[PDB]
Design a protein around this ligand. Sequence first.
Ligand SMILES: CC(=O)SCCNC(=O)CCNC(=O)[C@H](O)C(C)(C)COP(=O)(O)OP(=O)(O)OC[C@H]1O[C@@H](n2cnc3c(N)ncnc32)[C@H](O)[C@@H]1OP(=O)(O)O
Ligand SMILES: CC(=O)SCCNC(=O)CCNC(=O)[C@H](O)C(C)(C)COP(=O)(O)OP(=O)(O)OC[C@H]1O[C@@H](n2cnc3c(N)ncnc32)[C@H](O)[C@@H]1OP(=O)(O)O
Ligand SMILES: O=CCCCC[C@@H]1SC[C@@H]2NC(=O)N[C@@H]21
Ligand SMILES: O=CCCCC[C@@H]1SC[C@@H]2NC(=O)N[C@@H]21
Lengths: 214, 541, 541
Amino acid sequence: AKESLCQAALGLILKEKAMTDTFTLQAHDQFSPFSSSSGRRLNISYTRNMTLKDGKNNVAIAVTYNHDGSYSMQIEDKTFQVLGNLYSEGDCTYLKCSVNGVASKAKLIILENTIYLFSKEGSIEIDIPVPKYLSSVSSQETQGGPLAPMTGTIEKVFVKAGDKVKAGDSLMVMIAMKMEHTIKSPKDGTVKKVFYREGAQANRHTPLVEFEEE
Amino acid sequence: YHGDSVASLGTQPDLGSALYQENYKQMKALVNQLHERVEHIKLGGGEKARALHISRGKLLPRERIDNLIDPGSPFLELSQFAGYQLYDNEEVPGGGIITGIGRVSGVECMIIANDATVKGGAYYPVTVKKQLRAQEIAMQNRLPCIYLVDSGGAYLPRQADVFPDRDHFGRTFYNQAIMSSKNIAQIAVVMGSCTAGGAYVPAMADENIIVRKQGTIFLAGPPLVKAATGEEVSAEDLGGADLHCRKSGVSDHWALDDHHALHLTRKVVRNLNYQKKLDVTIEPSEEPLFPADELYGIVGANLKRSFDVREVIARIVDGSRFTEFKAFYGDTLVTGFARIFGYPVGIVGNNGVLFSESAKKGTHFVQLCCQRNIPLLFLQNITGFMVGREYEAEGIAKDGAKMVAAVACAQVPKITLIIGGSYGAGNYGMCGRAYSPRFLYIWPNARISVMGGEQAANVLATITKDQRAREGKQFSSADEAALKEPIIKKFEEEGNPYYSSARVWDDGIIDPADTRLVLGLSFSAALNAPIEKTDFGIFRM
Amino acid sequence: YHGDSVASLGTQPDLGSALYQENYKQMKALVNQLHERVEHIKLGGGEKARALHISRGKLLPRERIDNLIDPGSPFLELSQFAGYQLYDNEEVPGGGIITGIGRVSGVECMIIANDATVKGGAYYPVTVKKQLRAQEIAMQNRLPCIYLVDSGGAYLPRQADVFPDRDHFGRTFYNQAIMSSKNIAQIAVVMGSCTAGGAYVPAMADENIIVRKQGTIFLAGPPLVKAATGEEVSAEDLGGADLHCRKSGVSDHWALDDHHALHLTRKVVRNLNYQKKLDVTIEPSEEPLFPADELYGIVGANLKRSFDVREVIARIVDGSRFTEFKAFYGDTLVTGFARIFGYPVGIVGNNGVLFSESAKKGTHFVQLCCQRNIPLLFLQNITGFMVGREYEAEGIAKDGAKMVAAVACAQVPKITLIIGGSYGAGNYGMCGRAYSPRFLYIWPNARISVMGGEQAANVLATITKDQRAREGKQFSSADEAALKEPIIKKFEEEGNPYYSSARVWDDGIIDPADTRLVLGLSFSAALNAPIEKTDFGIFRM
Ligand SMILES: CC(=O)SCCNC(=O)CCNC(=O)[C@H](O)C(C)(C)COP(=O)(O)OP(=O)(O)OC[C@H]1O[C@@H](n2cnc3c(N)ncnc32)[C@H](O)[C@@H]1OP(=O)(O)O
Ligand SMILES: CC(=O)SCCNC(=O)CCNC(=O)[C@H](O)C(C)(C)COP(=O)(O)OP(=O)(O)OC[C@H]1O[C@@H](n2cnc3c(N)ncnc32)[C@H](O)[C@@H]1OP(=O)(O)O
Ligand SMILES: O=CCCCC[C@@H]1SC[C@@H]2NC(=O)N[C@@H]21
Ligand SMILES: O=CCCCC[C@@H]1SC[C@@H]2NC(=O)N[C@@H]21
């Protein structure tokens, strides 16, 4: 439970430290203190706060990079004193860590977006967040409404004033002066109305079809 | 072949000795006091400004820096005590700006961020000084720099100290142009509105990122436009990420939230296509043989007692291995070669009052290190200087000049640390702030001033005594203590480490325990700049 | 630190869409046609010449190249369609010469071999042009070159086009001297008789190998000597491997059969003592996330329909990872950074009719890449150009000049690919053939000409209409189609990819599927030449 969340949060750092270590090895200078994963600031104790998905409820974990190498994390006014390491049996790596004086070993398989803790007594499932900008939802939020790149005669519109909108469907075909280009629907929401009728022309960066808010 | 064993420096201080106990207690008191103050500074502008800054959806500057750097990496803040009680009644935590060096996408780079919480991100005179110091550090070390602008503009009530002078505001842009000229990268990130101070910065930088709503790039603010041209319009119409991106083209990228801007910045740094290369022999590094905290009991908080430098050197260098150079001759000064974090260094330190022989030894050592391309580190505790009729007859001043010339003409990176009291022209001799060391730090105990207070009081007493005797009413027996007391008090106030660190004479105040770590970081960054030829002026015999 | 995930370009095209089916069918037709023609070219001079060449014991040129290169390695032939129907009635497969780049003994080197089967190895004008193009490629890329001479001499019936002019025959020797001057190696191998064309080449080269019987080095052939000096003697007495080796010393080595000559050549290349070094950051490479053949359905064989460039970029770059630069501004043009086979590249592509803003964006991008030493790749589909009264009022031509100046002054390697129709001055703008790109290729669909046929027909109609109206008998309503038709037909003929590739305006016609592979090879070779400083002329504001 609460300890299990800490165990996974430790695993992210250890994997990140090791991958931080690997790039150091190929580098010219593998001796600088910068390569150290200490995360130490001058006169201040560095703290980073996490968020991990735990079934229905998100949990925020506050990781303070302690001065000695011990690892301090706190979730709902319960603190946990954690120290751990990564060692591999065969080809699979085990996570050995002690939380508040209790230590155990568990397989640590790490996917792209999920955290795996494997143990004799049971298994634990933790999910890493996905940034919204990386989720491509931000990509559709870049443009508020459709814009016509160039002025041209609209041959015909595939969508009526009120019509269902499918992904990939073309709003209209607009051909102009040695160029035909096909305008798509920016968003899957049902059209509020179509701005331009057949045969009309819209300038560069001009609205073409109104869409309901998603 | 590297099988020869080497003698190691340092011994075991007698813990039971009452002197060690006393020195330890003093050093703890100083370190504790420093820690509490640094906490209070890091709180920033205060709870209310934090509440408002959060309310706008922005991320607090400390959070921004933590997210930006490669996570799980050290970060080296500089001059945190800027503006400490410097002004009459205005609280300016951290000089209203956070500057430092960090590793991003595997490449070291300097981060400079405004603190809109503190006084709306106005540029106090100290703020400009701090920022310019950071930029010059980056250029000498040849490091890319990143700006996080959330500033309004120059502080109006003090315009004389900001706008006009050569080293004043605006020199920032000149440095920016020079940096971009010689391939040193520039990146600007916009999170807040800017009025002619953070307006040229994005235009001045090669790359640009601006948040969708909270970011607005405009040369003149809505009140400035309304007051000047008689026309009022919101800064978004002049600024705005979308508005500037679609048409103006000032913004090279368009981010939605603060996190998105940080992530894009990482991508750009990776694409920057730079590779670091070294030009010095490197070796495996091992920890010093003795605990660092013992330095407290060794040093204490009294300038009167003396501590041998070699104890400190043993506490610092790798494996506590050292090779003294010309040990018996000029014993008052110590020089030698050592290795720190696998890098070769030349250590120069002070034990006592300088003499002519010590100056000659230092000059010879400097020539050797410059010839062999070895970085230099200085540990100055100048309790006294070279003064005496016999000394000046043989031109001890001339030998001091030899120190000055050798230090000034040197081209290898130099780092200086003020372990003990610094006074007199020796500050000039042992690579003072004026002599452009790449860095400079002071322990919490050190006091720096031109002269000890007692000396100046005596000198003033004598000159007034002589002239007033010529005036017929000599400096009487009375008023002697009355005249002496203010001089002693004033020199004590000006010599305080916090007082100097309030200005930017030093890069920071560090406890002795962290010393070793800091040095390694500094030297690593300094190695980015390729070493160059060292040319010496006339060596006056 | 390189742990940040990056958004990937491209989507999944709707296969079921009838448009995709139609585009796929067109692209298959073109690719099939190209393949059949290339087969017929590779047969060479014909069965009878092959029978005779075998009868002499020589190895056919294709066999020679296969044996020479490091076995199991790619080889990149160039301009295979040279002389395709170029002359009136003379079949000249491959221009009577085979040129290419290959890896020999671990070192890249350019191979140039005559084809004595085709017209006795006579130098047609196109043959000289092809060979000189190869040599200039080798010099810019700084690569060793190897010659396999089996040529007779210049084609007599066309002596004006071969001998006299500056870029005509004989310039070969000048390039050879310059190459050997600046340490670029030269190797000549002789398998057949030579008359004043392959006579200076061995003397001009540093190293020389000649087969025992079939090789004869002589400045004047037996018929030339008999006709000129009135004295007849066999070319062996003037040539011969043994005869030249014992006394003349023209031959540095003496081989018995063709295989022996090839083996000796490998030995010499190994002894050449050269090592390749890179000066750009390199990273592991991974395949693009989407199949390449989808490009067919994406592109089709009609110039009217438009395809977004980012689809193609996703089909090409490593991992389909891309970072667009100033995306919203100047959307008609696309720029950004990517990595191909572990090498950094800057991609510039066209989506539509250029405007002033696009030109400014391109200029800024070019400056960045030149500053950071990043190679550049161009994907031009210029359906239309910048023409309009409002455009010319704001000096859109001036912005086009900014494109031209930035491209011309650039010094980093540049590669160009004509994915779509190229017309107008944009060819000059986007690193055309005249602007010395290191390479240039065209897809089977692209059409290149100064202007579309319809435009020229309209312009000619108007000018004749105006002048003839001034003449009193204006261009009548009749003859309008009669005048238009020939112009359209002629422009279509001159725009055909085979027509341009018949000449040496392009380095080759490649199907879209192979695209990625070819690029990697090209860039690797281009990295041999060390990068240099880029200096820019006056930037007219
Ligand atoms: C270069 C020039 O001379 S132009 C200078 C005039 N332009 C400005 O700076 C306008 C004021 N600043 C702004 O509004 C900036 O755009 C912002 C958005 C970054 C600051 O955001 P805010 O915090 O909302 O501005 P606000 O006015 O509340 O600033 C808070 C405080 O900073 C002070 N301040 C901020 N900028 C300046 C400035 N340029 N000069 C003097 N004081 C300033 C204000 O007096 C204010 O007083 P307080 O700290 O006692 O409350
Ligand atoms: C550079 C100068 O101007 S020097 C003057 C040129 N001198 C010559 O080349 C004389 C001609 N020499 C030849 O006959 C041949 O080139 C040889 C002997 C050197 C070797 O050529 P081979 O491959 O054996 O061809 P072969 O001698 O069997 O027949 C000659 C063929 O090559 C052609 N050919 C070769 N060289 C030339 C040339 N310089 N000019 C015109 N045609 C030539 C002939 O037209 C003939 O054509 P074909 O292929 O239709 O039969
Ligand atoms: O009888 C006329 C034939 C022309 C002979 C030309 C002489 S022969 C030697 C010399 N070499 C040449 O190429 N031309 C001259
Ligand atoms: O009707 C057909 C005439 C062809 C127009 C070509 C367009 S017009 C603007 C642009 N500039 C060119 O040179 N070509 C395109």
